[PDB]
Amino acid sequence: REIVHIQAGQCGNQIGAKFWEVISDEHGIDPTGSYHGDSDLQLERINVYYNEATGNKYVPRAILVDLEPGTMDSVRSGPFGQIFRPDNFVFGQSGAGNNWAKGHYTEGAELVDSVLDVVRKESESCDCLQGFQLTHSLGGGTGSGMGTLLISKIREEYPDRIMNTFSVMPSPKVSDTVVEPYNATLSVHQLVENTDETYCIDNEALYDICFRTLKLTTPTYGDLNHLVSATMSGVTTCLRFPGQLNADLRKLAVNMVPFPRLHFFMPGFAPLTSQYRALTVPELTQQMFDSKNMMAACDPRHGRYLTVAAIFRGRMSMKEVDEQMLNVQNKNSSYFVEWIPNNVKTAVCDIPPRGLKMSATFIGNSTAIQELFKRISEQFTAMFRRKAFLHWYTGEGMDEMEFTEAESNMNDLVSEYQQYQDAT
C-alpha cells in the first residue's frame, strides 16, 4: 500500500521536512533511520511511507525537488536531514524567481525528466503503489509551476494512480511577491484537472491562528509550519496506523468527492493551544468544527458540507465521540447537504500525537471553499485588468490568452461550488 511523497520548492520542502520529522517520531524512527519505538503498532504500516534498507533502516519514500539548492541544503543540515535517500535530492541552480512560467515551461522543464527518473525508481520498489502525495506552495515558481508540471507528467505515466496534494494558498497577509495570485490562479487550473484530492492550506488562516489563537504577536514561517505538519500527520493517521477503517487514498477519494472537480478540502485540527489541561470529548468536537480551527480561511457557515471526515486520536470514549458527532450534526443540520446520507464519517486511532492525550483532525469538502478561489480571483483581476507584472511571464514565452483561460477556469470552479450550495 505504498505512497510516494514529493516535495517541491521552498515551501514544499520546509513543510515536507517537518512532516517527516513529525511522523518519524510517531513511528519511532530516529534521525539515522533506526527504529527505536516500543509498540509494534508503530511498524504495522511503516511501509506505506518508508522503505526498509539493508541494515534494518527505514528510509522515507520521499523525493526532494527544487530549482535552487538553498532550501535543500537546509533540509540536509536539518534535524532529520540524514534520513533521506541522498540520490533523491534533485535540484538545479537557476531558481524560478517566484515565476510560474519559469517553473512550468523553462527552468522546470529542463529538470523534470530527472525527477521522473527518481519517481520511477521509487515506484519500482513498491509492492503495489497507492499513489502520490505532493507538498508545494501555489504562490511561488518551483512548487507552483514545476510542481503542477510534475503532476501532469506523473499522470501521463501513472494514469490510474491517486494524486493527492497539500497546497499552500498565498495571502497578502503573508506574502513574498505581488505575483502570487497569478501563480496561484495558473496552478489551481492544473489541480482541478490533475489531482484527486487537494488539501487547501491557506497562509491567511495559518497566520490568523498563530496570531489570534496561539497568541504569537509575530508569526514566522516556522510557526505556520507547525500547524501544517500537525495537520498533515492528522489526515494521514488512517494510512499510517491500523484501525477498523480499512481504507486508503482511493477509498478516501471515492467517499469524499461526489463530483470530480470538487476535490478541494478544508482541513482543521484540535486542540490548538497557547499546555497540560485535559480536553474533553465535547470540547474536542466543538473546536474541530469551529471556523477558528480551519486551515482554509473560509467560513463554513457560508456554505454547505458535501462530505466530512473526522479522525480522533487518543484513548477516549468512542461512545462519547459518536454522541458528540451526532450532536454536532443534529444541531447544525442546515450546513450539511441532505442529499448525501451519512456524509459525516468518524474514524479513531489509539495512538495520540506527540505531546497530547487526544486530538481530532477535520477534513471538510465544503462549498464555502469557493470563498478562497474568489479571493484569489479578485487579486488576479485587479492586476490583470491593467496587464500589470505580465512581462515577467511573457518573457518566458507565455501569452495573455493563457491567463484569460486560467481565470475563466477558476471562475467556473467557483460557479460549480455555488451550484451545489443551493442544491436541495
Binding site: D322, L326, N327, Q329, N330, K331, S333, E338, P341
Partner: protein, 347 residues
C-alpha cells in the same frame, strides 16, 4: 435542542402544536425531508413508517399509529367489530352494519326482510369513506334505493341501521352528535379530553321526510350551507358540555357523566384495547402517539351508539389552545422533556 419536521400542511391541530413547539425556544423545525428529526408530524397518506427509528442517536416519535386506519375507515371498522371477539357481532353499542360492494349484500337483505316483515322500523343509511365532505349519503326505508345507489357510486360502502329514535334537544326538537377527542400516547395510555362538542341540527327533526337531510345529518358543513336557523340556539351549532350537562339536569333530571359519559368511556376503551396488540409501539424501534375523533349518537333512552372514529380530527375553535397544549404536555414533552390535568385517563 429537539428537532421536528412538518409533513401535513392542512392539519389545523398540528399547525398549532408546531406553533407551540417553536415558542418554547427548545424545538427547531427542520425541512420536510431532513431525516435527523426527533418528532415527525406526518402526512395523512402513505406515511413512511418504515424509515422511522433507523437514525443513530435520535429517539424518534411520530403522531400517527401505523395500523390505526383499521378503526378509522367506515368499511374496516364494521369488519373489525364483527370479527374481533373482544367486540363481537353481539356488540350492543354499534348499530347493525354491513359492507356492500358494487361482501355482505346477501345478509343485509336477510335482516332487512326480517324487520320489514315484522313491520319494524326499517330505515337504513348508506355511507362510505370515499364519500367525504358532506355528500354521498342516502337515508332510505327501501333497500332497493340503497343498493341501486351504491352501484352508481362505485366504491366500498356500508349500510347501517339508521337510529330512528334520537335524543332531541329542546327547544327545537333537534338532532345532534357528540365529538370526543382522545389522545393515545407512546405508552398506550388512553386520555379523553374533558371538553367534548355537541354538533347540533338547527332544524326540527322530521321523521317522515328523509330526503331533505338537513335535520338528519349533523355535519357542520351541511348546517352552515343548507340550514335555516343556523346559529339561533348556539353559536356555530356547537353546544359544549357545561350547557349540555345543565340541560340534562333541567330536562331529564340526570347528568352528562351518568347518562352518557360512562358509555362513551366504555366504548373508547373497548375500541382502542382491541387494536392495542396490532399497533402498540412498546418495544418498537420508534414510538407513536395519535389524536382520535370519536363520533357518538344518543337515543331517546340515553343509550350511546358509536358512529365512526376519525383519525385526523380538527378541534372546535374555542378548544384549540387547551387541547393542543395538552398534546405537547402529554404526548411530546413526556418523551422530550423541556428544561391539574385536562384529560381523563381511561385505565
Amino acid at each position: 435542542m429537539y428537532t421536528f419536521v412538518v409533513r401535513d400542511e392542512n392539519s389545523s391541530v398540528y399547525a398549532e402544536v408546531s406553533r407551540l413547539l417553536l415558542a418554547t425556544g427548545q424545538w427547531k423545525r427542520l425541512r420536510k425531508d431532513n431525516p435527523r428529526f426527533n418528532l415527525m408530524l406526518g402526512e395523512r397518506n402513505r406515511l413512511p413508517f418504515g424509515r422511522l427509528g433507523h437514525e443513530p442517536g435520535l429517539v424518534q416519535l411520530v403522531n400517527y399509529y401505523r395500523g390505526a386506519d383499521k378503526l378509522c375507515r367506515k368499511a374496516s371498522l364494521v369488519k373489525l367489530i364483527k370479527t374481533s371477539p373482544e367486540l363481537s357481532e353481539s356488540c350492543t353499542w354499534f348499530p347493525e352494519s354491513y359492507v356492500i360492494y358494487p361482501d355482505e349484500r346477501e345478509v343485509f337483505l336477510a335482516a332487512y326482510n326480517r324487520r320489514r316483515e315484522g313491520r319494524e322500523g326499517n330505515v337504513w343509511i348508506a355511507k362510505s369513506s370515499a364519500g367525504a365532505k358532506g355528500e354521498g349519503i342516502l337515508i332510505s326505508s327501501e333497500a332497493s334505493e340503497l343498493l341501486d345507489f351504491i352501484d352508481e357510486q362505485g366504491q366500498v360502502h356500508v349500510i347501517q341501521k339508521y337510529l330512528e329514535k334520537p335524543l332531541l334537544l329542546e327547544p327545537g326538537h333537534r338532532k345532534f352528535d357528540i365529538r370526543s377527542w382522545v389522545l393515545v400516547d407512546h405508552l398506550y395510555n388512553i386520555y379523553l379530553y374533558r371538553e367534548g362538542v355537541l354538533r347540533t341540527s338547527s332544524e326540527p327533526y322530521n321523521s317522515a321526510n328523509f330526503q331533505d337531510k338537513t335535520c338528519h345529518l349533523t355535519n357542520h358543513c351541511i348546517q352552515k350551507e343548507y340550514s335555516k336557523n343556523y346559529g339561533r340556539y348556539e353559536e356555530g351549532n356547537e353546544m359544549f358540555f357545561e350547557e349540555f350537562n345543565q340541560y340534562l339536569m333541567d330536562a331529564l333530571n340526570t347528568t352528562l357523566e351518568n347518562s352518557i359519559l360512562l358509555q362513551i368511556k366504555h366504548i373508547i376503551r373497548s375500541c382502542l384495547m382491541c387494536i392495542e396488540p396490532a399497533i402498540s409501539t412498546k418495544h418498537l424501534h420508534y414510538q407513536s402517539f395519535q389524536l382520535f375523533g370519536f363520533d357518538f349518537m344518543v337515543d331517546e333512552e340515553l343509550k350511546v351508539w358509536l358512529i365512526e372514529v376519525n383519525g385526523a380530527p380538527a378541534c372546535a375553535q374555542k378548544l384549540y389552545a387547551e387541547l393542543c397544549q395538552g398534546i405537547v404536555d402529554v404526548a411530546i414533552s413526556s418523551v422530550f422533556p423541556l428544561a391539574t390535568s385536562i384529560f381523563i385517563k381511561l385505565h
